[PDB]
């Protein structure tokens, strides 16, 4: 199937208490592999996956030097934006940047990304064509014109199609045991009485990879979306994910209800029933 590499950067200003905080995280699909924390002692890009630990000093020094340049650009960027929005110096503000690439099942370039946020709102984003910008507001127009005139998008298209795809492919190859695996969900059901005439039926999906999953409940094969309590897919902490879906069932109607589990790890989707 398809794969992706994503880098997420968060810069938070700290008025009256030193330099802004800067965190970089890198992911390959749903697995994190690198980190940089401006508040940590190391001052280096660090491994967060076992398959990148043995990359070597040339990889490590280079990622450290580049991520250090990212911190300085954002440090300046915070000053620029506070100016653009006519804001006070005593307020804490947030700049977020995300970039990466999506490859198909054929392992070649499919989609590119490079976008910014300011205080949780979209600031600027590179469009799908990788040649044009989307400036969400009036203040963002200066950046949009500054980058259009400097032909910034051309340089961004070169990284997203080349280096990003090349390195995504190399990490997919090196971390083959974990990234190319498909852990199908381990399923179970629970039954608890709400009252004397009702009961909750909870459908569990555990220890699965990747995170993408569909959990649905049907009464006689008919849709029960509006009556299913559904939790956000959550990380187990061991590299796998969890999800549950629950319906309130009138006692004695347990046999009408079926839970359906859709996941890449299942050749055929599972149909579960309380019996």
């Amino acid at each position: 199937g398809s794969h992706s590499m994503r880098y997420f950067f968060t810069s938070v200003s700290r008025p009256g208490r030193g330099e802004p905080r800067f965190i970089a995280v890198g992911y390959v699909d749903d697995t994190q592999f690198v980190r940089f924390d401006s508040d940590a002692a190391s001052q280096r890009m660090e491994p967060r996956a076992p398959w990148i630990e043995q990359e070597g000093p040339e990889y490590w020094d280079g990622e450290t030097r580049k991520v250090k340049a990212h911190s300085q650009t954002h440090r300046v960027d915070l000053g620029t934006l506070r100016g653009y929005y006519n804001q006070s110096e005593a307020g804490s503000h947030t700049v977020q940047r995300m970039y990466g690439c999506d490859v198909g099942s054929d392992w070649r370039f499919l989609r590119g990304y490079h976008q910014y946020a300011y205080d949780g709102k979209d600031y600027i984003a590179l469009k799908e064509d990788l040649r044009s910008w989307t400036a969400a507001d009036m203040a963002a127009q200066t950046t949009k014109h500054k980058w259009e005139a400097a032909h910034v998008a051309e340089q961004l298209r070169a990284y997203l199609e080349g280096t990003c795809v090349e390195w995504l492919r190399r990490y997919l190859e090196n971390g083959k045991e974990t990234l190319q695996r498909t852990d199908a969900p381990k399923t179970h059901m629970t039954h608890h009485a709400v009252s004397d005439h009702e009961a909750t039926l909870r459908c569990w999906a555990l220890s699965f990879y990747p995170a993408e999953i569909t959990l649905t409940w049907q009464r006689d094969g008919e849709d029960q979306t509006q009556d299913t309590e559904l939790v956000e897919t959550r990380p187990a902490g061991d590299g796998t994910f969890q999800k549950w879906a629950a319906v309130v069932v009138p006692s004695g109607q347990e046999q009408r209800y079926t839970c359906h589990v859709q996941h890449e790890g299942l050749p055929k989707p599972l149909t579960l029933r309380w019996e």
């Binding site: 970089a24 890009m45 580049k66 300046v76 620029t80 950046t143 340089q155 280096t163």
Partner: peptide, 9 residues
């Protein structure tokens, strides 16, 4: 691998 580039808002 992260980008080299370096551009300002």
């Amino acid at each position: 691998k992260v980008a080299e580039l370096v551009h300002f808002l």
